[PDB]
């Protein structure tokens, strides 16, 4: 049994990364395309064998309610559009995969969750790293007690963003700067490595407003998290440096991945009672993208809840709001 | 042409690390011993060929003023004793090398600086990393513009401390916990990699007071620094995990060392234009310890100021006070 995906928003991630990876799925198939660019519907419709009956504009998208080949809509648009397309998908009776960050605000996340609940449909956020072999290995090491209690998580995510005109640098479409786009990986990792939710947050922002990229959103916003167990995290979020890594440490040792949450190329090193050494993770059945797609499908087929549901996305936005507030107010924000 | 060192406080660092390294010095020699343990004066005096005329107790130390073979006193005691022995050394007409952290407080550092200034004698703090090959190379890459402007410094220093009864875990002798002893390397590195002084500080403390080690001083205190250029630093200080590293990053690339500030074994990796790759630093004539020793001697011989004078030690204590305050008050402390 394969559930049918409609891919909505035929941009870079949709077309270069996600759509080719239906090849390795076991419970998912590409069934429909939704785009605001007619030429893309032609181009990708022809490449992927999607008939014209299964091609939608944003104007005709609500008609997808009458298409039984579509079980799931995967929303891969700028951040500010996640909420309205998720709600429309839910009202069309479809389950929803929504890219990160879930939405611009806590309230918007709550609205999305309510819409999917009202529709009796599932909602999953695209945290692909939870399906990635090295990340799974790190999480398991922590849970097995190989490090002892988690004491520190040090995680850096950033890239040198380019074109100042792109939607990521536009507040109305992005909802925020580096934290919304790439820093969220540092936050999400601190949460899944500790398995906890933070109770206190510090942050410092640094943005050169004379830079043509940064008239509207932030460049650097680094943050600290404290967790109930006493675990701590130091996190970097940046649009002016390249980094992608984390190290989690406890009294018995530590494990790190660098790059950690990239599309490929993960490398893990660990220090666990002996010397620091490369560590190969247990093999996964398929790549993180196909695994992410199949997870939602399998949840629907078995009546289970996604491991990264709307609530996970909401929990991130809750902390993101606190990070922005901590930097704005120059004080520790309690959660 | 060698200046005479009196080593004061014949503990681990003095006897196992420093004293053997006079061997590679070009302008420094071991001339005297000062100790509160008679057996050590005998043991090390005989081992290093130091005559009884050049052996002092803490009670007879002030007599060192009449010993023309002694040019410099190197104070290698618990932190709370740095100030009185430095002042006594200064009043005995000797130049002073003092171990980090300089003293317990800003006020104590100011007193030490004033005592050496009054005596017309030089004061240097034992920041050996400034003479270590990989560290010099990282500073050079930054200075030469290899990274572009510094945007982030991420640095972690910690070790799993053991015996609860040792002076480092006693507030009266240590002046504080991990930040005084090992976290100061994170701070000092953030300062010499940026070449700047911080203007804002955040901090989070995490200490289990039920742990036998941590009845009096702190375990983890992580901190954030903002610098005037816009550069940022995320720093870890810990007594319950092992770490020793930094990465400094700018728009053009980054460079890291892990271990960064160990006695030996430094390894550098850099990302400059292409994938991260190993980098061998420019070679140094002498190891970091001998180089540190000779630096003070050479400054005295040439009438120049140490690159790590008392004001460097003071600048660290100023930030350390801010870090402790930021963690206590849960707010960004301005400097
Ligand atoms: N999990 C991951 O690893 C990644 C997740 N993402 C997430 O995917 C989403 C899209 O990112 P990416 O694909 O990089 O962005 P792109 O700009 O490359 O594609 C965005 C697409 O959204 C559609 N769109 C609809 N309305 C607008 C609008 N007003 N302005 C611009 N585009 C619009 C367009 O598709 P059409 O022309 O068909 O309308 C556009 O091509 C973001 O939420 C991002 O966070 C991105 C990269 C990686
Ligand atoms: N730069 C570096 O890499 C390092 C710097 N250090 C610094 O060196 C100093 C000492 O560290 P370490 O050598 O590890 O400490 P140790 O405990 O090994 O040596 C401390 C010595 O100081 C003397 N001393 C004087 N008064 C006291 C006292 N009241 N209680 C205990 N000892 C006393 C003793 O020597 P005696 O018996 O001769 O009186 C004792 O052996 C500290 O300031 C530390 O920060 C330490 C390690 C590395
Ligand atoms: O892996 C890095 C990628 O992560 C994505 O979630 C971000 O949206 C992209 O901007 C980034 O390039
Ligand atoms: O990191 C190596 C050493 O650095 C010193 O400055 C600290 O005092 C020691 O406690 C530590 O072992
Ligand atoms: O790491 C730098 C060091 O490498 C050593 O192998 C060389 O002998 C030293 O001359 C040099 O300073």
PDB file of C-alpha atoms in Angstrom, chain A residues 170-315:
ATOM      1  CA  UNK A 170      11.904  39.198   3.884  1.00  0.00           C
ATOM      2  CA  UNK A 171      10.156  39.370   7.263  1.00  0.00           C
ATOM      3  CA  UNK A 172       6.640  39.122   5.825  1.00  0.00           C
ATOM      4  CA  UNK A 173       7.405  35.766   4.139  1.00  0.00           C
ATOM      5  CA  UNK A 174      10.033  34.310   6.490  1.00  0.00           C
ATOM      6  CA  UNK A 175       8.715  35.318   9.918  1.00  0.00           C
ATOM      7  CA  UNK A 176      12.260  35.903  11.150  1.00  0.00           C
ATOM      8  CA  UNK A 177      15.911  35.439  10.220  1.00  0.00           C
ATOM      9  CA  UNK A 178      18.494  32.702  10.805  1.00  0.00           C
ATOM     10  CA  UNK A 179      16.685  31.268  13.839  1.00  0.00           C
ATOM     11  CA  UNK A 180      13.574  30.521  11.802  1.00  0.00           C
ATOM     12  CA  UNK A 181      15.537  28.853   9.005  1.00  0.00           C
ATOM     13  CA  UNK A 182      18.669  27.164  10.239  1.00  0.00           C
ATOM     14  CA  UNK A 183      19.033  27.950  13.943  1.00  0.00           C
ATOM     15  CA  UNK A 184      15.914  25.880  14.512  1.00  0.00           C
ATOM     16  CA  UNK A 185      18.116  22.802  13.885  1.00  0.00           C
ATOM     17  CA  UNK A 186      20.235  23.725  16.923  1.00  0.00           C
ATOM     18  CA  UNK A 187      17.107  24.097  19.048  1.00  0.00           C
ATOM     19  CA  UNK A 188      15.429  20.949  17.748  1.00  0.00           C
ATOM     20  CA  UNK A 189      18.622  18.930  18.353  1.00  0.00           C
ATOM     21  CA  UNK A 190      19.076  20.258  21.893  1.00  0.00           C
ATOM     22  CA  UNK A 191      15.529  19.061  22.561  1.00  0.00           C
ATOM     23  CA  UNK A 192      15.822  15.594  21.004  1.00  0.00           C
ATOM     24  CA  UNK A 193      19.295  14.917  22.415  1.00  0.00           C
ATOM     25  CA  UNK A 194      18.234  15.796  25.978  1.00  0.00           C
ATOM     26  CA  UNK A 195      14.720  14.489  25.444  1.00  0.00           C
ATOM     27  CA  UNK A 196      13.690  17.508  27.511  1.00  0.00           C
ATOM     28  CA  UNK A 197      12.030  20.914  27.158  1.00  0.00           C
ATOM     29  CA  UNK A 198      13.908  24.027  28.296  1.00  0.00           C
ATOM     30  CA  UNK A 199      12.901  25.988  31.389  1.00  0.00           C
ATOM     31  CA  UNK A 200      15.134  29.010  30.840  1.00  0.00           C
ATOM     32  CA  UNK A 201      16.553  30.825  27.834  1.00  0.00           C
ATOM     33  CA  UNK A 202      19.292  33.426  27.222  1.00  0.00           C
ATOM     34  CA  UNK A 203      20.127  34.968  23.869  1.00  0.00           C
ATOM     35  CA  UNK A 204      22.393  37.501  22.181  1.00  0.00           C
ATOM     36  CA  UNK A 205      21.687  38.935  18.718  1.00  0.00           C
ATOM     37  CA  UNK A 206      24.278  40.392  16.376  1.00  0.00           C
ATOM     38  CA  UNK A 207      23.219  41.821  13.046  1.00  0.00           C
ATOM     39  CA  UNK A 208      24.943  44.406  10.862  1.00  0.00           C
ATOM     40  CA  UNK A 209      22.034  46.476   9.578  1.00  0.00           C
ATOM     41  CA  UNK A 210      24.281  48.096   6.959  1.00  0.00           C
ATOM     42  CA  UNK A 211      24.480  44.694   5.278  1.00  0.00           C
ATOM     43  CA  UNK A 212      22.027  44.650   2.343  1.00  0.00           C
ATOM     44  CA  UNK A 213      20.917  41.163   3.431  1.00  0.00           C
ATOM     45  CA  UNK A 214      19.790  42.161   6.898  1.00  0.00           C
ATOM     46  CA  UNK A 215      17.448  45.150   6.735  1.00  0.00           C
ATOM     47  CA  UNK A 216      14.523  43.103   8.033  1.00  0.00           C
ATOM     48  CA  UNK A 217      15.608  39.905   9.790  1.00  0.00           C
ATOM     49  CA  UNK A 218      18.436  38.815  12.100  1.00  0.00           C
ATOM     50  CA  UNK A 219      21.819  37.403  11.142  1.00  0.00           C
ATOM     51  CA  UNK A 220      23.293  35.918  14.329  1.00  0.00           C
ATOM     52  CA  UNK A 221      21.207  34.974  17.335  1.00  0.00           C
ATOM     53  CA  UNK A 222      22.971  32.645  19.751  1.00  0.00           C
ATOM     54  CA  UNK A 223      21.107  31.183  22.675  1.00  0.00           C
ATOM     55  CA  UNK A 224      21.508  29.221  25.879  1.00  0.00           C
ATOM     56  CA  UNK A 225      19.020  26.671  27.204  1.00  0.00           C
ATOM     57  CA  UNK A 226      18.658  25.197  30.675  1.00  0.00           C
ATOM     58  CA  UNK A 227      16.660  21.976  31.153  1.00  0.00           C
ATOM     59  CA  UNK A 228      14.940  20.537  34.283  1.00  0.00           C
ATOM     60  CA  UNK A 229      17.566  17.799  34.684  1.00  0.00           C
ATOM     61  CA  UNK A 230      20.272  20.442  34.848  1.00  0.00           C
ATOM     62  CA  UNK A 231      21.401  19.778  31.267  1.00  0.00           C
ATOM     63  CA  UNK A 232      22.567  22.910  29.418  1.00  0.00           C
ATOM     64  CA  UNK A 233      22.862  23.893  25.760  1.00  0.00           C
ATOM     65  CA  UNK A 234      24.912  26.556  23.967  1.00  0.00           C
ATOM     66  CA  UNK A 235      23.506  27.177  20.491  1.00  0.00           C
ATOM     67  CA  UNK A 236      24.595  29.174  17.454  1.00  0.00           C
ATOM     68  CA  UNK A 237      22.189  30.396  14.740  1.00  0.00           C
ATOM     69  CA  UNK A 238      23.784  32.383  11.907  1.00  0.00           C
ATOM     70  CA  UNK A 239      23.365  33.687   8.362  1.00  0.00           C
ATOM     71  CA  UNK A 240      26.983  34.904   8.022  1.00  0.00           C
ATOM     72  CA  UNK A 241      29.032  31.766   8.805  1.00  0.00           C
ATOM     73  CA  UNK A 242      28.891  28.106   7.817  1.00  0.00           C
ATOM     74  CA  UNK A 243      28.434  25.526  10.553  1.00  0.00           C
ATOM     75  CA  UNK A 244      26.455  22.380  11.092  1.00  0.00           C
ATOM     76  CA  UNK A 245      27.262  20.304  14.105  1.00  0.00           C
ATOM     77  CA  UNK A 246      26.568  19.193  17.597  1.00  0.00           C
ATOM     78  CA  UNK A 247      28.366  17.597  20.511  1.00  0.00           C
ATOM     79  CA  UNK A 248      26.482  16.160  23.482  1.00  0.00           C
ATOM     80  CA  UNK A 249      28.561  15.452  26.610  1.00  0.00           C
ATOM     81  CA  UNK A 250      28.098  13.839  30.015  1.00  0.00           C
ATOM     82  CA  UNK A 251      30.420  12.618  32.808  1.00  0.00           C
ATOM     83  CA  UNK A 252      31.176   9.344  30.998  1.00  0.00           C
ATOM     84  CA  UNK A 253      31.999  10.856  27.609  1.00  0.00           C
ATOM     85  CA  UNK A 254      30.625  12.580  24.544  1.00  0.00           C
ATOM     86  CA  UNK A 255      29.447  12.127  20.971  1.00  0.00           C
ATOM     87  CA  UNK A 256      29.447  14.615  18.118  1.00  0.00           C
ATOM     88  CA  UNK A 257      28.338  14.800  14.493  1.00  0.00           C
ATOM     89  CA  UNK A 258      29.852  17.239  12.000  1.00  0.00           C
ATOM     90  CA  UNK A 259      28.146  17.816   9.651  1.00  0.00           C
ATOM     91  CA  UNK A 260      25.107  16.839  11.739  1.00  0.00           C
ATOM     92  CA  UNK A 261      21.905  17.748   9.863  1.00  0.00           C
ATOM     93  CA  UNK A 262      23.083  18.113   6.281  1.00  0.00           C
ATOM     94  CA  UNK A 263      21.454  16.304   3.332  1.00  0.00           C
ATOM     95  CA  UNK A 264      24.386  13.878   3.310  1.00  0.00           C
ATOM     96  CA  UNK A 265      27.962  13.530   4.511  1.00  0.00           C
ATOM     97  CA  UNK A 266      27.364  13.059   8.255  1.00  0.00           C
ATOM     98  CA  UNK A 267      30.449  12.032  10.249  1.00  0.00           C
ATOM     99  CA  UNK A 268      30.290  10.980  13.909  1.00  0.00           C
ATOM    100  CA  UNK A 269      33.111  10.882  16.474  1.00  0.00           C
ATOM    101  CA  UNK A 270      32.733   9.660  20.054  1.00  0.00           C
ATOM    102  CA  UNK A 271      34.761   9.485  23.241  1.00  0.00           C
ATOM    103  CA  UNK A 272      33.303   6.788  25.510  1.00  0.00           C
ATOM    104  CA  UNK A 273      35.808   5.512  28.068  1.00  0.00           C
ATOM    105  CA  UNK A 274      38.589   5.129  25.548  1.00  0.00           C
ATOM    106  CA  UNK A 275      40.100   7.540  22.992  1.00  0.00           C
ATOM    107  CA  UNK A 276      38.005   9.727  20.657  1.00  0.00           C
ATOM    108  CA  UNK A 277      37.268   7.626  17.595  1.00  0.00           C
ATOM    109  CA  UNK A 278      35.122   7.680  14.451  1.00  0.00           C
ATOM    110  CA  UNK A 279      31.891   5.780  14.982  1.00  0.00           C
ATOM    111  CA  UNK A 280      29.725   4.219  12.270  1.00  0.00           C
ATOM    112  CA  UNK A 281      26.005   4.324  13.035  1.00  0.00           C
ATOM    113  CA  UNK A 282      23.760   1.282  12.718  1.00  0.00           C
ATOM    114  CA  UNK A 283      22.530   1.133   9.089  1.00  0.00           C
ATOM    115  CA  UNK A 284      19.050   2.521   8.356  1.00  0.00           C
ATOM    116  CA  UNK A 285      16.688   0.898   5.819  1.00  0.00           C
ATOM    117  CA  UNK A 286      16.568   4.024   3.658  1.00  0.00           C
ATOM    118  CA  UNK A 287      17.707   7.629   3.420  1.00  0.00           C
ATOM    119  CA  UNK A 288      16.329  10.307   5.751  1.00  0.00           C
ATOM    120  CA  UNK A 289      14.048  11.858   3.092  1.00  0.00           C
ATOM    121  CA  UNK A 290      12.314   8.670   1.969  1.00  0.00           C
ATOM    122  CA  UNK A 291      12.152   7.598   5.609  1.00  0.00           C
ATOM    123  CA  UNK A 292      10.460  10.879   6.561  1.00  0.00           C
ATOM    124  CA  UNK A 293       7.891  10.473   3.768  1.00  0.00           C
ATOM    125  CA  UNK A 294       7.181   6.855   4.672  1.00  0.00           C
ATOM    126  CA  UNK A 295       6.838   7.664   8.374  1.00  0.00           C
ATOM    127  CA  UNK A 296       3.720   9.776   7.839  1.00  0.00           C
ATOM    128  CA  UNK A 297       2.261   7.198   5.455  1.00  0.00           C
ATOM    129  CA  UNK A 298       2.901   4.373   7.919  1.00  0.00           C
ATOM    130  CA  UNK A 299       1.339   6.409  10.747  1.00  0.00           C
ATOM    131  CA  UNK A 300      -1.801   6.848   8.640  1.00  0.00           C
ATOM    132  CA  UNK A 301      -1.874   3.161   7.643  1.00  0.00           C
ATOM    133  CA  UNK A 302      -1.514   2.004  11.270  1.00  0.00           C
ATOM    134  CA  UNK A 303      -3.408   4.758  13.091  1.00  0.00           C
ATOM    135  CA  UNK A 304      -0.390   5.997  15.067  1.00  0.00           C
ATOM    136  CA  UNK A 305       0.928   9.489  15.851  1.00  0.00           C
ATOM    137  CA  UNK A 306       3.995  10.853  14.039  1.00  0.00           C
ATOM    138  CA  UNK A 307       7.109  11.079  16.183  1.00  0.00           C
ATOM    139  CA  UNK A 308       7.456  14.689  15.005  1.00  0.00           C
ATOM    140  CA  UNK A 309       3.862  15.901  15.036  1.00  0.00           C
ATOM    141  CA  UNK A 310       2.454  19.422  15.061  1.00  0.00           C
ATOM    142  CA  UNK A 311       3.163  19.496  18.800  1.00  0.00           C
ATOM    143  CA  UNK A 312       6.921  19.159  18.151  1.00  0.00           C
ATOM    144  CA  UNK A 313       6.770  22.104  15.750  1.00  0.00           C
ATOM    145  CA  UNK A 314       4.774  24.075  18.307  1.00  0.00           C
ATOM    146  CA  UNK A 315       7.278  23.332  21.068  1.00  0.00           C
TER     147      UNK A 315
END
